[PDB]
Amino acid sequence: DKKPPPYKHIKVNRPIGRVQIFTADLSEIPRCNCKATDENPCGIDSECINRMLLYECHPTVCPAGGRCQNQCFSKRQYPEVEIFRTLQRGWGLRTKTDIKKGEFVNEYVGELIDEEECRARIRYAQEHDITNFYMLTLDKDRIIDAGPKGNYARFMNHCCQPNCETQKWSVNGDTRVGLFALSDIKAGTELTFNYNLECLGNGKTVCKCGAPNCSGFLGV
Amino acid sequence: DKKPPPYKHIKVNRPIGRVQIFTADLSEIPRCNCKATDENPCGIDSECINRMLLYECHPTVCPAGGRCQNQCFSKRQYPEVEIFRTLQRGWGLRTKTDIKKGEFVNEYVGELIDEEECRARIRYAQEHDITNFYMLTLDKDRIIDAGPKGNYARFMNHCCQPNCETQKWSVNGDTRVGLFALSDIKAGTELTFNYNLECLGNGKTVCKCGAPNCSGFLGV
Numbered sequence: 001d002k003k004p005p006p007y008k009h010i011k012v013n014r015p016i017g018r019v020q021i022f023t024a025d026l027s028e029i030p031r032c033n034c035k036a037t038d039e040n041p042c043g044i045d046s047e048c049i050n051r052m053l054l055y056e057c058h059p060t061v062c063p064a065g066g067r068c069q070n071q072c073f074s075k076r077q078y079p080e081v082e083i084f085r086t087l088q089r090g091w092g093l094r095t096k097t098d099i100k101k102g103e104f105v106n107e108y109v110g111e112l113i114d115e116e117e118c119r120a121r122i123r124y125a126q127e128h129d130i131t132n133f134y135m136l137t138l139d140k141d142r143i144i145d146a147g148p149k150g151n152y153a154r155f156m157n158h159c160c161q162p163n164c165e166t167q168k169w170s171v172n173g174d175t176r177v178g179l180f181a182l183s184d185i186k187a188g189t190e191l192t193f194n195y196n197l198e199c200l201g202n203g204k205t206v207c208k209c210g211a212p213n214c215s216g217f218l219g220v
Numbered sequence: 221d222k223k224p225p226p227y228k229h230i231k232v233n234r235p236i237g238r239v240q241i242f243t244a245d246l247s248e249i250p251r252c253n254c255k256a257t258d259e260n261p262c263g264i265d266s267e268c269i270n271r272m273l274l275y276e277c278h279p280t281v282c283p284a285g286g287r288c289q290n291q292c293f294s295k296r297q298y299p300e301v302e303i304f305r306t307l308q309r310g311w312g313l314r315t316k317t318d319i320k321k322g323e324f325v326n327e328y329v330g331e332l333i334d335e336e337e338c339r340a341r342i343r344y345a346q347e348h349d350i351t352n353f354y355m356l357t358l359d360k361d362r363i364i365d366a367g368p369k370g371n372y373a374r375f376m377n378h379c380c381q382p383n384c385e386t387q388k389w390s391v392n393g394d395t396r397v398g399l400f401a402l403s404d405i406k407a408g409t410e411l412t413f414n415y416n417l418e419c420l421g422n423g424k425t426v427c428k429c430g431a432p433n434c435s436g437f438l439g440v
């Protein structure tokens with residue numbers, strides 16, 4: 001209870017076994033029409049077509065060059081966060097800097113596994129009386145398991161009225177799960193999101209989010 | 221058992237209650253670089269950027285005009301299919317025409333509902349000893365229920381080695397689930413797909429797909 005159980009802090013998703021990882025030729029990556037002279041080229045308020053489709057601008061082709069603000073996953077531009085111990089929800093994540101509405105908070109990084117491996121790892125965890133799951137569905141047949149290996153995003157708890165959301169983006173021709181702010185978040189505030197249908201294994205865990213509209217479940 | 225239980229055969233997804241339905245300005249829709257003179261403009265073999273991102277070309281802007289082959293959802297270009305009675309998997313869908321690998325087969329159409337309404341409808345169905353579910357997750361918080369209202373796609377069974385797959389496309393700025401052929405399908409063959417993580421409510425139903433690699437479950 002002094003420190004969270006050991007995990008491998010990794011920078012990017014790690015395929016495991018028979019999980020495939022797509023990658024894109026420039027042919028397959030869209031090109032925006034921002035200009036280097038725009039106020040915040042490819043920025044959150046811009047009309048960047050790439051941004052609007054949840055695509056990163058690729059740096060070798062973005063007409064805004066080095067000023068492009070649409071590479072938040074690639075450059076890993078995470079606001080400063082600290083792991084803290086909550087009351088009833090185990091370990092939590094909070095921000096040490098102010099975050100503006102819509103700003104990129106983090107990527108949910110971990111091991112990529114299939115239905116069979118995810119089932120296996122859930123069975124093992126139950127038999128050992130484990131209630132902490134880090135499984136988040138990437139697409140129809142791949143699951144992020146931030147349990148063994150992950151980054152700071154793995155400590156973000158569920159809340160039924162959250163202050164961040166997940167968004168599925170395309171980066172170098174593959175899906176990445178991003179956390180983005182639903183509103184302005186003041187420094188020291190806990191970063192949560194609604195698990196909705198995306199997280200697995202939580203089953204009958206009783207929600208302790210403390211939100212007025214709390215369903216008593218972690219999404220489902 | 222003479223005919224499948226009654227449903228409302230609808231053409232497009234119907235939001236229910238508090239489910240929101242996004243729509244796009246042309247600002248928010250990507251533009252391809254095909255030419256009207258290309259062999260199959262925006263066709264399955266083309267380098268259409270819209271096609272590669274699973275976006276329809278919008279007809280008012282596609283540089284290929286009326287020759288654009290990337291409007292399969294909007295125009296509803298479904299090969300001819302017939303409902304037939306299977307041995308152990310209830311009602312099934314089969315094609316009456318040859319289908320080529322990668323060709324658009326159908327859209328999975330139905331009522332759009334949230335986690336709460338989907339849970340409710342599953343509880344009711346169990347209490348009435350119902351084993352047929354038509355629930356397929358659209359995105360993180362919306363579910364297609366092709367049960368009450370749907371189209372021919374609702375009769376496609378699960379198979380662990382299927383001949384079609386789902387693809388999530390964007391049409392007029394919202395997600396649509398499409399069925400596409402994994403290989404050439406000869407006329408009279410049953411159209412199936414692997415439910416993977418996408419279908420809900422099936423739980424412990426034993427798979428009767430008849431595939432050599434059959435897991436004995438409908439995806440999970």
Ligand SMILES: C[S@@+](CC[C@H](N)C(=O)[O-])C[C@H]1O[C@@H](n2cnc3c(N)ncnc32)[C@H](O)[C@@H]1O
Nearest residue numbers: 089090091131132133154155157158207208209
């Ligand atoms: C992604 S982990 C979050 C970090 C976790 N608290 C820890 O100690 O590492 C998700 C797990 O934390 C717990 N948890 C997260 N949000 C919760 C909530 N709102 N209410 C209760 N438990 C929650 C559940 O056990 C869940 O499986």
Ligand SMILES: C[S@@+](CC[C@H](N)C(=O)[O-])C[C@H]1O[C@@H](n2cnc3c(N)ncnc32)[C@H](O)[C@@H]1O
Nearest residue numbers: 309310311351352353374375377378427428429
């Ligand atoms: C989308 S409906 C398919 C049409 C359904 N057979 C009918 O009679 O309307 C899915 C349901 O059909 C059954 N089903 C589909 N694929 C199956 C399979 N491979 N094995 C067993 N039952 C299956 C299950 O009861 C499932 O809930």
Ligand SMILES: [Zn+2]
Nearest residue numbers: 032034042048
């Ligand atoms: Zn841009």
Ligand SMILES: [Zn+2]
Nearest residue numbers: 042057062068
């Ligand atoms: Zn850019």
Ligand SMILES: [Zn+2]
Nearest residue numbers: 160207209214
């Ligand atoms: Zn709650």
Ligand SMILES: [Zn+2]
Nearest residue numbers: 252254262268
């Ligand atoms: Zn095109």
Ligand SMILES: [Zn+2]
Nearest residue numbers: 262277282288
């Ligand atoms: Zn086109």
Ligand SMILES: [Zn+2]
Nearest residue numbers: 380427429434
């Ligand atoms: Zn099977």
